[PDB]
């Protein structure tokens, strides 16, 4: 149901990180989530969805999730992906790598994804 999407370290800055991804994985306007962190950026589609506590244990927690690994140093599945940087064509889309897995943490489960631009 849920699938997060993210990045750590981001060369383009949050900037709105936010509409770069914008629910690249499911969601169409406002159905997106996204927490701003240094080094660590989560973009999640929990539009109506909370793990209990308004972003708790994962939403906030696979900051942490990709605060203590990284891009490539994690055991993911790889694809090679272009993402549009929130702004318009001048914005264009860059190319990026897709890292899928997942992020257990325990109350929730859903399919992550690093999506370094």
């Not at 750590?8 to 962190?37: I, P």
């Not at 001048?90 to 109350?107: A, E, I, N, Y």
């Amino acid at each position: 149901m849920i699938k997060a999407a993210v990045t750590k370290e981001s060369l383009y800055r949050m900037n709105t990180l936010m509409e770069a991804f914008q629910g690249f994985l499911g969601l169409d306007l406002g159905e997106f989530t996204f927490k701003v962190k240094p080094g660590v950026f989560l973009l999640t589609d929990v539009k109506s969805y909370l793990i209990g506590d308004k972003y708790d244990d994962a939403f906030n927690a696979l900051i942490d999730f990709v605060l203590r690994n990284d891009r490539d140093a994690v055991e993911g599945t790889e694809t090679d992906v272009s993402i549009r940087l929130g702004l318009s064509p001048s914005d264009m889309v860059v190319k990026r790598q897709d890292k899928t897995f997942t992020f257990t943490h325990g109350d929730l489960e859903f399919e992550v994804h690093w999506i370094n631009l």
